[PDB]
């Protein structure tokens with residue numbers, strides 16, 4: 066449940082790349098071969114939290130999705146409501162140096178997705194260095210993910 070100490074939301078803004086993940090979703094343990102690195106743009110929201118705008122390629126086009134991360138009452142901690150999945154999730158920035166990487170941890174808080182748990186690696190570049198990949202693997206292990214649940218996302 067750790068949140069980056071002295072979190073500076075303004076320094077967390079801008080362009081990130083979703084470079085790895087690990088989850089307890091059976092769906093991932095199966096459908097990981099199909100997942101690709103996505104760009105995610107982080108900007109402040111009207112409520113003092115964050116809008117996360119992610120893009121991915123389908124056929125000839127780059128689709129855009131936005132997720133509102135509402136502040137959850139300590140800096141670096143957020144909540145996300147998924148109407149499609151009838152669930153709310155806690156999202157925490159556990160660790161970040163702002164300029165190279167962030168380690169995020171998301172967990173179900175309300176609704177049928179309550180059980181859900183996911184670690185995410187954000188990278189400022191599309192090529193995370195080996196030391197960062199090692200950091201993420203170690204982070205995921207600390208969170209209870211086995212090796213075959215950890216996925217590094219190809220560019």
Ligand SMILES: CCCCC[C@H](O)/C=C/[C@H]1[C@H]2CO[C@H](C2)[C@@H]1C/C=C/CCCC(=O)O
Nearest residue numbers: 083103105119120121130146147148149150
């Ligand atoms: C960086 C973390 C955010 C990534 C989310 C990303 O924008 C969406 C990825 C989609 C497409 C690529 O793999 C599949 C298709 C994935 C399906 C995700 C659907 C989310 C629906 C629930 C919701 O988020 O409210």
Ligand SMILES: CCCCC[C@H](O)/C=C/[C@H]1[C@H]2CO[C@H](C2)[C@@H]1C/C=C\CCCC(=O)O
Nearest residue numbers: 090091092093147150151152177178179181
């Ligand atoms: C067999 C039905 C479950 C589908 C499996 C699916 O890949 C899992 C999706 C998870 C993750 C994405 O949004 C959350 C986290 C979802 C929660 C899991 C099941 C939702 C069940 C919906 C319901 O029962 O009302």
